[PDB]
Ligand binder design. Structure first.
Ligand SMILES: *[C@@H]1O[C@H](CO)[C@@H](O)[C@H](O)[C@H]1NC(C)=O
Ligand SMILES: *[C@@H]1O[C@H](CO)[C@@H](O)[C@H](O)[C@H]1NC(C)=O
Ligand SMILES: *[C@H]1O[C@H](CO)[C@@H](O)[C@H](O)[C@H]1NC(C)=O
Ligand SMILES: *[C@H]1O[C@H](CO)[C@@H](O)[C@H](O)[C@H]1NC(C)=O
Ligand SMILES: *[C@](C)(O)CCC[N+](C)(C)C
Ligand SMILES: *[C@](C)(O)CCC[N+](C)(C)C
Ligand SMILES: CC(=O)CCC[N+](C)(C)C
Ligand SMILES: CC(=O)CCC[N+](C)(C)C
Lengths: 532, 532
């Protein structure tokens, strides 16, 4: 049967799924690691023990234990990101959408969900890979990994909670795809990993980590990069947060052994209820448990690795959205609201600046304020609002990504940069948020092809154009069709530094994406805070 | 006789002068202090001893000993500023242009020449006040004062060379005008002092100095302010330069007494030949001997006086030119030339930045560079050139003046701000220099009314409009005609901060003159250099 596949771990029974008045195979909930439960909490993942009989891969697996956003109960804009299936520490599974009839050796794309390393699910509606698998004839795989303390609590030195275990879960999945994807018609030698936000940072981290490089061919990073200020913490900071988490749960803190044992006796939701109490500063776009620069998964500092070229050299495609910072300002900055235009007073602007650059002293804060304030009209509430949006977006996503792309392109084998700036006609979020963080995903996964979702024709066209760029790139290392008559997405070079806009209008090529502001965040500000 | 006037110091015989197919009286070279020669060098000025008989005031007096610009021999653009009469330490004289027939009590305007406190002459062609006196029916007076070491060598504590004696020369002249101007038909109670550059800084310094406040009614400052970074030095810095000047002339440096005696035995040109060797840094727009914050002429720091309102409260009219920095870049910055377009490479830009902000450390220099560099086109030689022009102009003239105006307007009784941006059609300097420092003077003195100078009709109109603004202001404290039908120059207020452009087009009102850049120079940069 086409829905039956035998793998090195055992046999799995898929399920026929309808997609755009057609059908393809879907293998949901395939286990790739032993359930990281009990004394295994915080530990490195163990490979899933082979099973006898047939594994029922007809329905989505559980979602990992995580904080659930209840900021707007019933609101689809926020709940579409929440876990849509029961939560459980037993959540290490992956999903595969296979074209019908089953291919023999077609391109493979592996999706790594974002969510600040504190949340995320591979089962979300917006991540359904049947449209991309069907439309582009690729084997679409979506993995899962532990988030929150469960996947990133870090007590470097200890082996019961070394940290980065969530990254290792991802690797374990990539390893499984490498070893078994062939049986589903996929080519293990043409696997492209791609993810957004923390998933984008994850992708970059696998490009950097020696132990992950050989498990994939190419990479796509969407609004995320390994060097993002929120993507990692030092060994010391990780430890401090783990201890503080223990302090929040009335744990014995005499030793890592005692601390870890206590955290392991606590129920999932217990750790999640106090998770946000460990942050060092009052800030936005900062998450408690994230990857740690341990000297193992990451040999040395990310910056020294990028400088020295200590990373996988291949082709990459990446980009950002126009309004990367609007999302987090709405959730934490004073003066922002979901149902108002959120015009920001100068007082709230100042408060917002301090929340956005937590590690900054007075001089630094002044530097930022000056850089983003129009002193000819400093009380303009819209300019203040949009100003904060740019600060949060430039500081947390765009500039870090631009630093990464410029450093990688030095040793890489081909770079393709994009700037996504189209606002969905059916977006349910307020207009002031613009082209929101993560809203390019629905176009990447082909949602605009489903008439019932109420997208416009032009948007359906953009989605198809994007899906084909991603798929053609994964397959060839170039998003463009060899001898095509359509506009060519130029290669990003150290010299020209070209990129394209991704919207519904005819393609346009630009250069030096956000160069002015990124010189400030990547070169000047760091130097200032360090000198002072 | 109309050309004969008896004053408290004695009688003076003027000379009838033709002006625009007409005539007025001119009293040139009237002494107002004893010749500061011999053992009087570096000393405070002594009032001129009354004389018997008639003093021949028919020809211009000598010019004070000063450095002479020979950078472009034969070139009128530079030589029009050089002394046009024999130099001599015996140079303390003033000139008066009196309307004919002699008025009884008309408005008086006193001109204070600029020249960085190291040069200047009251006899220059561009300073001839016959056009302004004739056209506006005002008594025009132009004083003179010692420049260079002669007027500003400062060894605070000593009474033989206390410093600021050049400022006291100006005051002595103002005192003479106060006591005798009435005999020439002038009203001692309606005297407006005005000057450009160092003359503008001088005007502001008399507004600040308790001992000068009562000697005038109003003030006009052209491209100069008391707080300009080049307008003054500390007691310590002044002393260091005096000692260094002595060191350059092989002087005994065992004591102020010995040092001063030596400097006094040296011939004028001897001190002038080594004058520029005392500057502390490699820099442009910096002069060796300038006013000193002594605790006498200036009670406390200029900034504390401005903050506390410790200054004469009256009405003031002031402004700047569009390209204030081009002049000094041509003379000292690498890459600039008089006969080329002076397109600046990035290397020369960097060199130029360091010459413009001498007191800046690396971080500061980076701050400036970032503030004035277009990172989307950083190799554009024209942008680099014009960028340096703005830096030198903003840092040395505009921003200091904006700080002064905003501080004064707080306690003052009326402020009128202008932005002069018209480039003379007959300017002999290269086009890249734009609206050069000091080229608004010829319009202030009415040169465009002399057909032979080859100005355009529109320019003659602007000159008349400017002359009338200045004269109406000196007379009433408001540049506008009471019930006039012409455009009204709005009053500058703390709230609105309005100003006007001064050119040949119809008047336009703007607000926040150069606010963005001045926030950087007046607030941010100072804070940065101080924190680091
Ligand atoms: C990529 O690598 C191939 C072979 O190593 C080389 O021929 C090609 O020039 C490279 N292309 C880029 C964009 O560096
Ligand atoms: C100037 O002073 C007069 C009298 O002291 C006062 O009536 C007037 O309001 C003042 N004007 C300004 C511009 O401050
Ligand atoms: C898989 O189990 C059986 C087939 O063995 C199938 O009927 C069922 O729907 C699947 N799982 C569920 C939804 O219980
Ligand atoms: C002033 O002196 C006489 C009048 O006493 C006059 O002829 C002469 O021209 C004036 N000074 C000069 C130029 O010698
Ligand atoms: C990224 C910080 O990991 C942000 C995740 C955003 N969503 C939209 C995917 C949840
Ligand atoms: C000011 C520094 O004192 C510059 C004087 C410029 N001129 C044009 C009047 C000589
Ligand atoms: C970005 C986030 O959704 C942060 C959510 C807000 N808390 C930190 C308060 C839970
Ligand atoms: C502004 C000046 O004219 C400076 C002149 C140049 N030297 C300092 C070298 C004499």
């Amino acid at each position: 049967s086409e829905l039956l596949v035998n793998t090195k771990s055992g046999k799995v029974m898929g399920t026929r799924v309808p997609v755009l008045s057609s059908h393809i195979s879907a293998f949901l909930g395939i286990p790739f690691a032993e359930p990281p439960v009990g004394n295994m909490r915080f530990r490195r993942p163990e490979p899933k023990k082979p099973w006898s009989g047939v594994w029922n891969a007809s329905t989505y697996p559980n979602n990992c234990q995580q904080y659930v956003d209840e900021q707007f109960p019933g609101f689809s804009g926020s709940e579409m990101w929440n876990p849509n299936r029961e939560m459980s520490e037993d959540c290490l599974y992956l999903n595969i959408w296979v074209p019908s009839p089953r291919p023999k050796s077609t391109t493979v794309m592996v999706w790594i969900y974002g969510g600040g390393f504190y949340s995320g699910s591979s089962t979300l509606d917006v991540y359904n890979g049947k449209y991309l698998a069907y439309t582009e004839e690729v084997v679409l795989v979506s993995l899962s990994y532990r988030v929150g303390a469960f996947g990133f609590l870090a007590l470097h030195g200890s082996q019961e909670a070394p940290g980065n275990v969530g990254l290792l879960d991802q690797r374990m999945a990539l390893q499984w795809v490498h070893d078994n994807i062939q049986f589903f018609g996929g080519d293990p030698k043409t696997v492209t990993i791609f993810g957004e936000s923390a998933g984008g940072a994850s992708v970059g981290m696998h490009i950097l980590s020696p132990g992950s490089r050989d498990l994939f061919r190419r990479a796509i990073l969407q609004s995320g990069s390994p060097n993002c200020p929120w993507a990692s913490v030092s060994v010391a900071e990780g430890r401090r947060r783990a201890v503080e988490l223990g302090r929040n749960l009335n744990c014995n803190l005499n030793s890592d052994e005692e601390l870890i044992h206590c955290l392991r006796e606590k129920k999932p939701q217990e750790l999640i209820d106090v998770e946000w109490n460990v942050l060092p500063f009052d800030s936005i776009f900062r998450f408690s448990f994230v990857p740690v620069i341990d000297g193992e998964f990451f040999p040395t500092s990310l910056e020294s690795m990028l400088n020295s070229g200590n990373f996988k050299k291949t082709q990459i495609l990446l980009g950002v959205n126009k309004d990367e910072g609007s999302f987090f300002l709405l959730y934490g900055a004073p003066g922002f609201s979901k149902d108002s235009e959120s015009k920001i007073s100068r007082e709230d602007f100042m408060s917002g600046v301090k929340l956005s650059v937590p590690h900054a002293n007075d001089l630094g804060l002044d530097a930022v304020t000056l850089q983003y304030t129009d002193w000819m009209d400093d009380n303009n509430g819209i300019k203040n609002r949009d100003g904060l949006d740019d600060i949060v977006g430039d500081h947390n996503v765009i500039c870090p990504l631009m630093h990464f792309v410029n450093k990688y392109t030095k040793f890489g084998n081909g770079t393709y940069l994009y700037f996504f700036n189209h606002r969905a006609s059916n977006l349910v979020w307020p207009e002031w948020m613009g082209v929101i963080h993560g809203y390019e995903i629905e176009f990447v996964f082909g949602l605009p092809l489903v008439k019932e979702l109420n997208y416009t024709a032009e948007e359906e066209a953009l989605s198809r154009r994007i899906m084909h760029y991603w798929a053609t790139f994964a397959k060839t290392g170039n998003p463009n069709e060899p001898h095509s008559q359509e506009s060519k997405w130029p290669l990003f070079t150290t010299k020209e530094q070209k990129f394209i806009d991704l919207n519904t209008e005819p393609m346009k090529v630009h250069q030096r994406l956000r160069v002015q502001m990124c010189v400030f965040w990547n070169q000047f500000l760091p130097k200032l805070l360090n000198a002072t």
